[PDB]
Design a protein around this ligand. Structure first.
Ligand SMILES: Nc1nc2c(ncn2[C@@H]2O[C@H](COP(=O)(O)OP(=O)(O)OP(=O)(O)O)[C@@H](O)[C@H]2O)c(=O)[nH]1
Ligand SMILES: Nc1nc2c(ncn2[C@@H]2O[C@H](COP(=O)(O)OP(=O)(O)O)[C@@H](O)[C@H]2O)c(=O)[nH]1
Ligand SMILES: [Mg+2]
Lengths: 432, 430, 100, 57, 280
């Protein structure tokens, strides 16, 4: 009765949705062809065809056929609906103007119609889930355009954003500072929940925990799949305290302009060291709050804490949950803001985490995933604005944007709104 | 799907195109008769990029061979892999150029441009979604440097949105084949700065140094130089032709490597290159590849790259690899060579990954970079041009076909302006 | 015997298959479409095609021909009577034939 | 001069014919090994351990 | 500080400089030659394969009382060139259908390539095996050359498809089963055209060969043509009639002559010979 709609745009969005849907089908026991072996906890992600397979409530978007047709040729060709894998004609080529003003216009309408058709079938729609790459052309382009269209088409339906921002020193493109700024402006007024998913912060986690010295994007995506599953398992599995997506835009964002949060995941252990570790609730809770364990390259010790929501899955006990929370409050190096005396929202799920064969993560009886709203996120915006202006001063690479049909004055408000947000975060942290 | 058409002119253009077509046919598993006899399905889903489709179970390249003398094309027709090209794409004159820019651009080029324009146009609307162009020619020759550039001007007039790339081999003062190369070199390069979206320079002396120092082969010909150029070419569109983890196409490369409209001149290089002796004695790995990529003596241009500063650079990685080591090597080399990278732009190097390694290799990298060291060749050619023009030597041949000295003056003035505004960014500070 | 397959319905069948190919992709195409499947499964790469492959081949391109009708068209196509049909001859008959 | 025909291909194949033999200058006991496989082609379906690929040998 | 390319150089046997690189390069050339020997793709090995199978032996069928009959293996010779006809399977004609050209070869030594068979195209009233004049028949190739039976056919003249050199009506060896394979025998003397109908044909005498759908007489001309086995000449179909005209419509209008009897002679380029075995 409760369903969510997943949106995957850009190369990063496609390559993370692939892993997340693989884990979803494996967890729900749905074969890659789409049929259960048969030898109502799946409506949130799959819809019955009356007699036969289960079809996902997901849509794929990209303006190049490379990633799309590979899925069409892979082992999942019978699973996805043939006409909901939208493929374009020309790559955006790391340009914001194309994906937002010229070539996305004739593709967004088809996506809107497909989303209309998908949502008409659903009767108890809960919200939206969007996965996009910000440092990319069509990723930031359509994602902004689709968010703009959705905010006026549906309105009050909540939407949650898992965006991948560029890392401080880990980077691929050179013109990524430009289109990164604009997407932030586009999403600031239109996305209810935003989560940081940079790459370096996960790179170090692998070396520290799983002892992986040669990682690739596959390890990156599978962890994000675990995060999404631990976030959404409350909808589809029983537990002591069920938490809907409604108590996210109600328990984590004190002000409408303040909705940028970052997450962490624990435990992260390999298959060899699992049997020698206590792995009790107290240890896993402490590991979540470690600054080096954060999913985003941002140190919380430079800012306060506003609101944290953590979801437990497995055989956890309220005693263990409450005991660790008391110790966390007592210990000093983690600090909260004065005007928020209570800052924890805990949800309990009885289902243990599901481990995919062929992965690095080992089978564990307990896990915790938490989302934290802090004031330290202003640092990543500070370093992004500096990189922006340091090369915008000479108006480099601008002609690539204006010559495609883009107004030069657009960068003006993109700069000032980001500074306003930075000073909002700075002002919130002052004590009364 | 985003297929690209090929244009080549002159003897140099014909040889480069023939070798490139041979290499790409070997990569795609194409028989000399045009029949596919590969083993994978990965060589078919993107075959339309380079080969058109005809009856009889055969594939035909979309290449045009254009020249004023039929000798080179008649030879390549009888040569190996000479049956792939349609005879209708062979267009030739009966007079030649005599290595004269005026003859190649005004007298016979004007009357011969119609057929090549017609064939390139029909090939253009042949494809549903055109992507761009790629050119091979010699700026030191007459027919190529004149008539190919005239075709460049016409096609840029006709299609303003599509991309166009030039792989131009320019004369070098160390070896002089003709006594009037600076004239037509300056006249040609005057016309590329406003038309070519991408320009990539190649030096015969640089290739000779590569052969003598890395390959260490005693007897070189033009064939191995042609193979090196063809490998450099095939490395560019590997991500476009094959699946990978991070696909980057020509226009992504352009927008990521071009800071300003008049700075579209690039330097290229290819790795790994080794002598036949130690082929099995070194490890092919990310650090070794990235260390040999940025070698000063490995470049395809005679210009010394450590006398200038890099603006932007691009690396196109091939083979099954991991992103951590690639990006860590990029960051490490950028940090270690902070004196050789311009300070007012952060992270000025681009990395892309293609999962299909080339023939006979497991890892390969194609390097394209834009640096302020390119201007040395422009300085030297301008000095030679001024020295040879101050005495008005050999000017009557050019001016006997309506050419005027004022256009030569404009060409040299534009060269000087480009050199000045290209070298000023080296000393420009934030 | 109930009935023997007649030339009338043989012509009907061969017209049905011949038109179905035309709809797919473009006009210059569909010959490589036919060829790539034979490249996919002709492991012994000898160029000789069998009756069991015919059923499998037509199953792939959305034409489930009846076994009796498939036998009739298979028998009518070949004159060698060896139960093996050359692939290029089959392609020629299906595509490059002035008469139905 | 006799210059029998067989000697011609023998020398152009071994005694510096004015070409090079099928990219073997760029090669790397025997190297043809047309090798191909992408991340999604094997990792998601063949279920191959993400460390097991690359791994030059 | 051992340096290379020091002016004049000896061979790789000495150790003057860069000897290892050329020796290693020379070594790999033989290894690549060995690999090309390992897989059956040597350019050398291909030409003996075409040498042996084309130049194979065959026994020519003997003719009794100089009368040819169906099922024989006979020679076809053109007296104008004094040469026998042959077929080159390796050379493929330019057409959608797979057809192979035929040329006439000066050497008269009996080979498999120049060995041919004749067979009854379709049932005729003449139940006897002896062929009579004006009886349709089709030429067939020896079964050892190709497992598929191949026939000699010729398609109508078209600006699109014509002879490579003669530019006229062209002949080819094709797998076609149609009426185009039909041929008929024909006499030399212009006076005995209509009389010899239904009469047995003998071997060793000159004879004409005529195509039924086109009524064009097969012949050869002195135009140079080349293939794997040296230099030869082409064959085709053409009416090599006399140039001088006759007031023939006047003849029927008055009532002196008739259409069936021809009024024009032809040159000897169209004449051909049937050669059988010398010994039984
Ligand atoms: N973590 C992670 N990031 C990815 C992955 N794929 C792409 N990205 C991010 O995407 C950025 C490059 O843009 P892409 O996503 O590849 O391309 P795009 O967003 O579709 O935009 P265009 O290139 O114009 O098509 C990189 O900087 C990465 O940070 C992935 O598999 N995992
Ligand atoms: N790399 C390369 N350079 C060549 C080749 N052929 C000629 N050149 C160079 O081109 C110059 C002469 O160019 P030219 O033949 O007059 O140009 P064209 O008249 O347009 O064909 C010489 O200095 C050569 O070094 C070749 O096959 N490869
Ligand atoms: Mg992309």
């Amino acid at each position: 009765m409760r369903e969510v709609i997943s949106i995957h745009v850009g190369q990063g969005g496609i390559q993370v949705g692939n892993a997340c849907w693989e884990l979803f089908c494996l967890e729900h026991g749905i074969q890659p062809d789409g049929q259960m072996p048969s030898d109502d906890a799946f409506n949130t992600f799959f819809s019955e065809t009356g007699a036969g397979k289960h079809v996902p409530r997901a849509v794929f978007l990209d303006l190049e056929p490379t990633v799309i047709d590979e899925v069409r040729t892979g082992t999942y060709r019978q699973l996805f609906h043939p006409e909901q894998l939208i493929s374009g004609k020309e790559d955006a080529a790391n340009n914001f103007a194309r994906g937002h003003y010229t070539i996305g216009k004739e593709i967004v309408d088809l996506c809107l119609d497909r989303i209309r058709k998908l949502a008409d079938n659903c009767t108890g729609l809960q919200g939206f889930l969007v996965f996009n790459s910000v440092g990319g052309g069509t990723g930031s382009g359509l994602g902004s355009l689709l968010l703009e269209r959705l905010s006026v088409d549906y309105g009050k339906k909540s939407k949650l954003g898992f965006t991948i921002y560029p890392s401080p020193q880990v980077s691929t493109a050179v013109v990524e500072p430009y289109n990164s700024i604009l997407s932030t402006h586009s999403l600031l007024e239109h996305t209810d929940v935003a989560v940081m998913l940079d790459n370096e912060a996960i790179y170090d986690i692998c070396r520290r925990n799983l002892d992986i010295e040669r990682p690739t994007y596959t390890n990156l995506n599978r962890l994000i799949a675990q995060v999404i599953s631990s976030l959404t398992a409350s909808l589809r599995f029983d537990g002591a305290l069920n938490v809907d997506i409604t108590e996210f835009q109600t328990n984590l964002v004190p002000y409408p302009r303040i909705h940028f949060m970052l997450s962490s995941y624990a435990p992260i252990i390999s298959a060899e060291k699992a049997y020698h570790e206590q792995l009790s609730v107290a240890e896993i809770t402490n590991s979540a709050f470690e600054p080096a364990n954060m999913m985003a390259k941002c140190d919380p010790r430079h800012g306060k804490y506003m609101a944290c929501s953590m979801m437990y899955r497995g055989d956890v006990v309220p005693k263990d949950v409450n005991a660790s929370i008391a110790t966390i409050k007592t210990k000093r190096t983690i600090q909260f803001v004065d005007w928020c005396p209570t800052g924890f929202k805990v949800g309990i799920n009885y289902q243990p985490p599901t481990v995919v064969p062929g992965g690095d993560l080992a089978k564990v009886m307990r896990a915790v995933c938490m989302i934290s709203n802090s004031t330290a996120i202003a640092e990543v915006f500070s370093r992004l604005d500096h990189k922006f202006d340091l090369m915008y001063a000479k108006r480099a690479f601008v002609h690539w944007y204006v010559g495609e049909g883009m107004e030069e004055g657009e960068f003006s408000e993109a700069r000032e709104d980001l500074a306003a947000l930075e000073k909002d975060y700075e002002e919130v942290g002052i004590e009364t | 799907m985003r297929e690209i058409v090929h244009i080549q002119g002159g003897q140099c253009g014909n040889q480069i195109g023939a070798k490139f077509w041979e290499v790409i046919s070997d990569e795609h598993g194409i028989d000399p008769t045009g029949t596919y006899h590969g083993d994978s399905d990965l060589q078919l889903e993107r075959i339309n990029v380079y080969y058109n489709e005809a009856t009889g179970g055969r594939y035909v390249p979309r290449a045009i061979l254009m020249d004023l003398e039929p000798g080179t094309m008649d030879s390549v027709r009888a040569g190996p892999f000479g049956q792939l090209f349609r005879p209708d794409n062979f267009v030739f004159g009966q007079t030649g150029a005599g290595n004269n820019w005026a003859k190649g651009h005004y007298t016979e080029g004007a009357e011969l441009i119609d057929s090549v324009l017609d064939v390139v146009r029909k090939e253009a609307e042949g494809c549903d979604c055109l992507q761009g162009f790629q050119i091979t020619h010699s700026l030191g020759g007459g027919t190529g440097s004149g008539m190919g550039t005239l075709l460049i001007s016409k096609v840029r007039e006709e299609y303003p949105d599509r991309i166009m790339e030039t792989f131009s081999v320019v004369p070098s003062p160390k070896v002089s084949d003709t006594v009037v190369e600076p004239y037509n070199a300056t006249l040609s390069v005057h016309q590329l700065v406003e038309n070519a979206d991408e320009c990539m320079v190649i030096d015969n002396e640089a290739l000779y140094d590569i052969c003598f120092r890395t390959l260490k082969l005693t007897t070189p010909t033009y064939g191995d130089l042609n193979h090196l150029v063809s490998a450099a070419m095939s490395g560019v569109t590997c991500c476009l032709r094959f699946p990978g983890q991070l696909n980057s196409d020509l226009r992504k490369l352009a927008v990521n490597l071009i800071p300003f409209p008049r700075l579209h001149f690039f330097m290229i290089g290819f790795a790994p290159l080794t002598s036949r002796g130690s082929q099995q004695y070194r490890a092919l790995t990310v650090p070794e590849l990235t260390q040999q990529m940025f070698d000063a003596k490995n470049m395809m241009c005679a210009a010394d790259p450590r006398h200038g500063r890099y603006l932007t650079a691009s690396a196109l990685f091939r083979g099954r690899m991991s992103t951590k080591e690639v990006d860590e090597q990029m960051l490490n080399v950028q940090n270690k060579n902070s004196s050789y990278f311009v300070e007012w732009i952060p992270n000025n190097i681009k990395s892309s990954i293609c999962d299909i390694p080339p023939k006979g290799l497991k890892m390969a990298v194609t390097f394209v970079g834009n640096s302020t060291a390119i201007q040395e060749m422009f300085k030297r050619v301008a000095e030679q041009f001024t020295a040879m023009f101050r005495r008005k030597a050999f000017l009557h041949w050019y001016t006997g076909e309506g050419m005027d000295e004022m256009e030569f003056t404009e060409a040299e003035s534009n060269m000087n302006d480009l050199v000045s505004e290209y070298q000023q960014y080296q000393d420009a500070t934030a | 015997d109930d009935l023997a397959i007649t030339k009338e319905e043989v012509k009907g069948i061969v017209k049905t298959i011949r038109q179905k190919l035309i709809q797919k992709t473009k006009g210059a195409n569909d010959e490589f479409l036919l060829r790539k499947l034979f490249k996919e499964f002709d492991i012994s790469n000898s160029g000789f095609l069998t009756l069991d492959e015919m059923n499998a081949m037509l199953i792939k391109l959305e034409i489930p021909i009846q076994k009796r009708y498939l036998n009739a068209v298979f028998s009518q196509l070949d004159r060698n009577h060896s139960g093996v049909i050359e692939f290029e001859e089959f392609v020629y008959y299906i595509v490059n034939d002035p008469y139905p | 001069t006799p210059i029998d025909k067989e000697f011609n291909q023998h020398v152009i194949f071994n005694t510096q014919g004015v070409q090079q033999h099928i990219l073997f200058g760029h090669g790397v006991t025997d190297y043809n090994k047309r090798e191909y496989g992408t991340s999604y082609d094997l990792s998601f379906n063949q279920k191959i351990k993400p460390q097991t690929q690359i791994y030059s040998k | 500080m051992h340096n290379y390319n020091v002016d004049r150089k000896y061979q790789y046997n000495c150790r003057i400089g860069n000897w290892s690189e050329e020796w290693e390069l020379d070594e790999y050339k033989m290894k690549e030659y060995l690999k090309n020997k390992e897989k059956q793709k040597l350019v050398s090995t291909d030409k003996e394969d075409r040498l042996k199978r084309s130049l194979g032996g065959v026994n020519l069928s003997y003719a009794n009382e100089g009368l040819v009959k169906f099922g024989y293996t006979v020679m076809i010779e053109s007296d104008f060139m004094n040469a026998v006809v042959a077929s080159n399977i390796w050379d493929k004609i330019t057409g959608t259908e797979e057809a192979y050209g035929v040329t006439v070869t000066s050497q008269k030594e009996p080979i498999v390539r120049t060995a041919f068979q004749l067979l009854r195209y379709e049932q005729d009233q003449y139940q006897d095996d002896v062929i009579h004049y004006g009886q349709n028949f089709k030429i067939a190739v020896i079964s050892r050359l190709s497992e598929k039976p191949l026939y000699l056919t010729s398609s109508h003249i078209t600006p699109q498809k014509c002879a490579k050199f003669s530019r006229k009506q062209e002949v080819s060896i094709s797998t076609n089963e149609g009426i185009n394979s039909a041929w008929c025998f024909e006499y030399m003397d212009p006076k005995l055209r209509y009389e010899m109908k239904g009469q047995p044909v003998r071997s060793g005498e000159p004879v004409l060969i005529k195509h039924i759908p086109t009524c064009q007489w097969l012949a050869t001309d002195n135009v140079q043509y080349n293939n794997e086995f040296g230099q030869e000449f082409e064959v085709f179909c053409n009416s090599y009639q006399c140039h001088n005209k006759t007031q023939n419509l006047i003849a029927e209008k008055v009532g002196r002559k008739t259409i069936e009897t021809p009024m024009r002679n032809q040159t000897n380029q169209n004449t051909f010979r049937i050669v059988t075995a010398l010994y039984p």
